[PDB]
Design a protein around this nucleic acid. Structure first.
Ligand SMILES: Nc1nc2c(ncn2[C@H]2C[C@H](O)[C@@H](COP(=O)(O)NP(=O)(O)OP(=O)(O)O)O2)c(=O)[nH]1
Ligand SMILES: [Mn+2]
Ligand SMILES: [Mn+2]
Length: 538
DNA sequence: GACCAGCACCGC
DNA sequence: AAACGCGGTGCTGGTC
């Protein structure tokens, strides 16, 4: 390409190099652009950002986030990654997309700009005729990237002092647990080492080995195994408690306070748009889509996520989302009637397994019911179900029988989905998002049946993701007009931040937008709450 | 220091 | 652990 002077013409494809993957923390090391057979390299990247009206190219969102960090309104536009991701969700990295569609992903901005131009031309050509995939690109993914950019650049407020004090408290308790484990073992050892713990439990203490690990075939010390051994030795109980606290302390309590950005004073995650096989987003650096919430200590961690002074958090979460999607996709009249009558399958399964009235079901019980309802739906075995439900194997097999017998159209849909996946080689969501599942024709049963479970799950989970994404695209401009912020997304949930005097109005509006994003054969219901912290708003 | 495989874990 | 699915992160143990 002919090297031309900065700036480039409007509509050029951008290429950029970051000192680190996180745009909110990265130094913009180089900036370049390409169009019309030319390449423009910026003398000073930061100054050069002011010259762009739109970020078109690979990882456009990341550059837009960095521009927002610097107070620049540089929205993301076309991104070859989103085109490749829609053609095949296994296209998740620029390294692979480049090598697959005509280029090489290097570490030079000028080459990345030229690569973005070449890959867009080729990928856009491959989507000619894919009307449904082009609709998802034009109406969902491309506009969503702008929404995610603003979310990432905004961040969430965290109660640092609260978590600092919590760290010191949990530390003392971990010391009491580790000292108790060492005494029962008769000697000290690295309790974090599952190899050393394996010997203590199964060689020294002589406890029975329940299961083995996948790759190396060692005797597993997983929670499920230890749960089965909860009454075989007092050490097992202390280990489970040690595992819980060290996990929450090492992954959330201690790391998150150190990630507050100096310029914003807030915590900034990344929402990765081409990371999953089903169309879901993912969150990383740090992951804010798996913040603790189940246990009492987990709830205390949620409370650390707070609203800015004078603001309130608004949390909206779809009710029984994939079950409602399943009703629409399958067309089972019985399942449809469940939601038309306002029933809650999670509560009903919870009341059955715990033997208590509906009003006695606590959040912990309901989460346990979710595992069963979705576990059974997506192919859980009676053997595992018997252990999860703590019932005889014969009763567990009966549970799976009544489950599908209650909704006979579900099985018919599963077989229709798998058959089409075998013939076409991919399954699709309600909006046409595809996932290629070639192992549906595999000759090894284990491999084949694994692909099958992945296959007919993707339309359900993927449609829910399509719906959530479309709702985010619709809702974002409405929140801007009301002075509200979109902070976090958790697959079927949104966390917003609104002025105290507008929180009620935002909550009502966001609820309506989410529930009416795309009318289905069943109503989409959203649970909404308002509070100064994430747990309160739930 | 950086990277990795493997086990284990958090929540959707 | 096991015939639920989708992710990301910490630790250990190992390498370079
Ligand atoms: N296969 C599978 N899918 C799951 C699991 N947990 C969550 N999902 C999927 C299916 C879920 O629909 C979706 C959202 O998870 P939630 O919002 O926590 N549960 P929901 O919306 O169903 O119920 P409600 O909001 O009334 O409490 O994530 C699981 O253990 N397994
Ligand atoms: Mn939900
Ligand atoms: Mn949810």
């Amino acid at each position: 390409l002919e090297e031309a002077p900065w700036p480039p013409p409007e509509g050029a494809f951008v290429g950029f190099v970051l000192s680190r993957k996180e745009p909110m923390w990265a130094d913009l090391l180089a900036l370049a652009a390409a169009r019309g057979g030319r390449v423009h390299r910026a003398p000073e990247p930061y100054k050069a950002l002011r010259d762009l009206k739109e970020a078109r190219g690979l990882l456009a969102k990341d550059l837009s986030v960095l521009a927002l960090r610097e107070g620049l309104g540089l929205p993301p536009g076309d991104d070859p990654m989103l085109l490749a991701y829609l053609l095949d969700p296994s296209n998740t990295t620029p390294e692979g997309v480049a090598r697959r569609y005509g280029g090489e992903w290097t570490e030079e901005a000028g080459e990345r700009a030229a690569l973005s131009e070449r890959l867009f031309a080729n990928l856009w050509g491959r989507l000619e005729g894919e009307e449904r995939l082009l609709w998802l690109y034009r109406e969902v993914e491309r506009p969503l990237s702008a929404v995610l950019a603003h979310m990432e650049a905004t961040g969430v407020r965290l109660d640092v002092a609260y978590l600092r004090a919590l760290s010191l408290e949990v530390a003392e308790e971990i010391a009491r647990l580790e000292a108790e484990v060492f005494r029962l073992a008769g000697h000290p050892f690295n309790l974090n080492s599952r190899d050393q713990l394996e010997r203590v439990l199964f060689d020294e203490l002589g406890l029975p080995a329940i299961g083995k690990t996948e790759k190396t075939g060692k005797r597993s010390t997983s929670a499920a195994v230890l749960e089965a051994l909860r009454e075989a030795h007092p050490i097992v109980e202390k280990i489970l408690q040690y595992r819980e606290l060290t996990k929450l302390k090492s992954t959330y309590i201690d790391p998150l306070p150190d990630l507050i950005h100096p310029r914003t004073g807030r915590l900034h995650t990344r929402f990765n748009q081409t990371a999953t096989a089903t169309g879901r987003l993912s969150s990383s650096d740090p992951n804010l889509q798996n913040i603790p919430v189940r246990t009492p200590l987990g709830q205390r961690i949620r409370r650390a996520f707070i609203a800015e002074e004078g603001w309130l958090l608004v949390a909206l979460d779809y009710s029984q989302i994939e079950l409602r999607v399943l009703a629409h996709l399958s067309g089972d009249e019985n399942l449809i009637r469940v939601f038309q009558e306002g029933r809650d399958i999670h509560t009903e399964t919870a009341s059955w397994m715990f033997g208590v009235p509906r009003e006695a079901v606590d959040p912990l019980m309901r989460r346990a019911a979710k595992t069963i309802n979705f576990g059974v739906l997506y192919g859980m075995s009676a053997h595992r179900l018997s252990q999860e439900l703590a019932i005889p194997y014969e009763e567990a097999q009966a549970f799976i029988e009544r489950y599908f017998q209650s909704f006979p159209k579900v099985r018919a849909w599963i077989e229709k989905t798998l058959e089409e996946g075998r013939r076409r080689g991919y399954v699709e969501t309600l909006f046409g998002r595809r996932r290629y599942v070639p192992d549906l024709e595999a000759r090894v049963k284990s491999v084949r049946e694994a692909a099958e479970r992945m296959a007919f799950n993707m339309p359900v989970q993927g449609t829910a993701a399509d719906l959530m994404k479309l709702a985010m695209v619709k809702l974002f401009p409405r929140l801007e007009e009301m002075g509200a912020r979109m902070l976090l997304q958790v697959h079927d949930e949104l966390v917003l931040e609104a002025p105290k005097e507008r929180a009620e109005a935002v909550a009502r509006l966001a609820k309506e937008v989410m529930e009416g994003v795309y009318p289905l054969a069943v109503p989409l219901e959203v649970e909404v709450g308002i509070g100064e912290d994430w747990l309160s708003a739930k």
